[PDB]
A paper describes a structure:
Major histocompatibility complex ([name]) class I molecules bind peptides in the lumen of the endoplasmic reticulum and present tightly binding (high-affinity) peptides on the cell surface for recognition by cytotoxic T cells. We find that both the A and F pockets contain side chain triads that undergo such concerted changes.
As glycerol molecules tend to bind into the [name] class I peptide-binding groove and to stabilize the [name] fold in partially empty crystal structures, we switched to crystals of dsA2/GM that formed in the presence of 1,2-ethanediol (EDO) at 10 mm free dipeptide and determined a crystal structure of dsA2 at 1.6 Å. This indicates that the GM in the F pocket is more mobile and possibly prone to leaving the peptide-binding groove. We conclude from this structure that dsA2 can accommodate two dipeptides at the same time, one in the A and one in the F pocket, and that they are bound like the N and C termini of a nonamer peptide. We next asked whether binding of the methionine side chain of the GM dipeptide in the F pocket of the dsA2/GM2 structure triggers conformational rearrangements of the F pocket side chains compared with the smaller C-terminal valine side chain of the NV9 peptide. This is indeed the case: to accommodate the methionine, the side chain of Tyr116 flips towards the center of the peptide-binding groove to form a hydrogen bond between the phenolic hydroxyl group and Arg97, which is also pushed in the direction of the A pocket. We conclude that A2 can accommodate a bulky side chain such as methionine in the F pocket by increasing the volume of the binding cavity through a coordinated rearrangement of a triad of residues, namely Arg97-His114-Tyr116.
Author numbering:
A (entry chain A): 1 to 275
B (entry chain B): 1 to 100
Write the structure that this text describes.
Amino acid sequence: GSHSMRYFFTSVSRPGRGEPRFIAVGYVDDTQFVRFDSDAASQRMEPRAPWIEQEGPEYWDGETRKVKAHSQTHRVDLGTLRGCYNQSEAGSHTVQRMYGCDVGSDWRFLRGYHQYAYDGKDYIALKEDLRSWTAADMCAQTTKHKWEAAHVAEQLRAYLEGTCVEWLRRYLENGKETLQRTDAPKTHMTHHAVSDHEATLRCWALSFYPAEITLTWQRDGEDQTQDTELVETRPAGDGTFQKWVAVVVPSGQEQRYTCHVQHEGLPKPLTLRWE
Amino acid sequence: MIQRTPKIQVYSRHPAENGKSNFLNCYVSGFHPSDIEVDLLKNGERIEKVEHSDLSFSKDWSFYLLYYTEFTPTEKDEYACRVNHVTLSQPKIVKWDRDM
Ligand code: MET
Ligand code: MET
Ligand SMILES: [Cl-]
């Protein structure tokens, strides 16, 4: 299975109610492993997966120093962006940043990412080549000019292809019992009569890992995605995931409807029937 | 400003059995901006012990949080999640339905 390491930063201005809120989280695949919260008492990068606890003091001090430094750059960014967009000083705004790396089954570099949003909209992103930027609006083109002149992309590319991959390997090993597992979904369908003439069919996938899955309905072999209610894949709390997909059907047509499940834990795609 | 409405899911960790300790989850996803209020309710009252995940976001930049607590499903106790967000005119209450 392919794997990823990602950091997610969220910075929110709150004019007159404090300095901006800053929250940082780190993930390996779908498993969170560290956090920082500027409003918390500790003012430390903190562990959130058992397998990171073993890291030594150089690690916690280093990550703490880095995350605080990132909080400060984002604090100043909120001012730069408010100014560029000619926004009022009163309003709350959001900066987001995501970066990290993907490796394949073989733990070799696949892809890197480094990208930003302002108020929920793409702002600037490093392209897949890790050499060039995507910047739609004029404010982001100004940033792009500055980042080109400062050779920012080159520094980011070096992290993403090197250090990022090294950390990802270490964590995957330290965490291998968790991270290098597959839990196949436990599947079933439920039927509930909404009335005398229609029934809700719900196709369930429970207790699966990793999170990627596909659930689809067919009616006499015809894909029903347009008529299907598909919920967002959701955490059970225990490091496994759950998902369901539902269709509302005329009572008596249940046998026409089949649910199709795809997951890496499954030797073969599964079809569930009413029969 | 961009605003995106929370998608609320309220559910148990394990298949529920009356009298058997379990975990009640309220997963809220796809929202923007990040300020949100989320409560788990037992018989309409806020559960005070509730924990939540650290704020994170999806590839589309929308935020997600899991709120969770230990709970014991029973025949007559009603569980729910109550969510408020700038996109909602008033708090949205979603009841736990164990028969889904
Ligand atoms: C948690 S801030 C530091 C994140 C990451 N380990 C880095 O070196 O960029
Ligand atoms: C999207 S936050 C980055 C803004 C950047 N530091 C600038 O000064 O243009
Ligand atoms: Cl944003």
